[PDB]
């Protein structure tokens, strides 16, 4: 059905950060981290979806719905 303006299937750098409500990208407002990752065709998704950049913490970071890429070997939590 219908879609706003945000019909870009790539994601915003900033998640839940970003400070405009009408923004032309996808955008992580939730703590989950999406099924489909960047391959997903949601533009309703409010998930974790990638982007092509480093991580500000690489193997410090334990955010698991994060915006960057992480190095080889890092760990993250779970409960399972
Ligand atoms: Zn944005
Ligand atoms: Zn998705
Ligand atoms: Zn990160």
Same mark, same amino acid.
């Given at each position: *059905?219908? #879609? *706003? +303006?945000?019909? +870009? #299937?790539?994601? &915003?750098?900033?998640?839940?950060?970003?400070? @405009?409500?009408?923004?032309?990208?996808?955008?992580?407002? +939730?703590?989950?981290?999406?099924? %489909?990752?960047? @391959? &997903?065709?949601? /533009?309703?998704?409010?998930?974790?979806?990638? /982007? @092509?950049?480093?991580?500000?913490?690489?193997? @410090?970071?334990?955010?698991?719905?994060?915006?960057?890429?992480?190095?080889? *070997?890092?760990? #993250?939590? %779970?409960?399972?």
């Amino acid at each position: *059905g219908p #879609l *706003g +303006s945000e019909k +870009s #299937l790539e994601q &915003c750098k900033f998640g839940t950060h970003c400070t @405009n409500k009408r923004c032309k990208y996808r955008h992580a407002r +939730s703590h989950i981290m999406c099924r %489909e990752g960047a @391959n &997903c065709t949601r /533009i309703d998704c409010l998930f974790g979806h990638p /982007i @092509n950049e480093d991580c500000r913490f690489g193997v @410090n970071c334990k955010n698991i719905y994060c915006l960057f890429r992480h190095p080889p *070997g890092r760990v #993250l939590p %779970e409960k399972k």
